[PDB]
Amino acid sequence: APAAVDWRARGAVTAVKDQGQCGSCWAFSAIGNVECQWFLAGHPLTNLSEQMLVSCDKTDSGCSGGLMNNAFEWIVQENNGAVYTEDSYPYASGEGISPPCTTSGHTVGATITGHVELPQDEAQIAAWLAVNGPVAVAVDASSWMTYTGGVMTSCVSEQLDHGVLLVGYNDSAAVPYWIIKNSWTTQWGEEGYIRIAKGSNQCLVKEEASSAVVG
Predict the structure, then answer these.
(1) Is 106 a residue of the active site?
(2) What is the effect of changing residue 164 to F?
């Protein structure tokens, strides 16, 4: 695979968002992945709706957590593949309470047809990402609250408790790293991103990697 990849160089990644006090990391991870895959399929980069998932996907648990793979399945199996635009279904859970689902008044911004679940292998995830784009991953982010920059070598790696988005990597650095988009505003981390060491399953990053499929 290439020595380094960063899908921001393609303009494929939307701005960093703010999940607020809702436990909706799973939705930001899944939607961020869809946004990138939709762009990479040859469509304008579009902000898509986390709130659709948080409110409407009853296989996941709203502001009390969820799984990106469940979200992808809900979109295809219960929502006809459709993902509404953020503009037409804006986020309304920042205080920690998700409103009930509404089915009317929204605009379809993307469609997915399925999702892939990738091997539990950092090199194979990296190789897939190099060709096919950003990858949703579960991580242990329990130690991340005060991260301000650098390559996190120090990740607790005990329990998956967060979903984030791999957008690239750099295998050439002395400590190789993944490049991860978080959903805690651009005031956290490196303009809202984090680099974690790559190759030692830091933060359990290899355990639950997946991507939506467009087309």
Answers:
(1) no
(2) In clone 1800-4
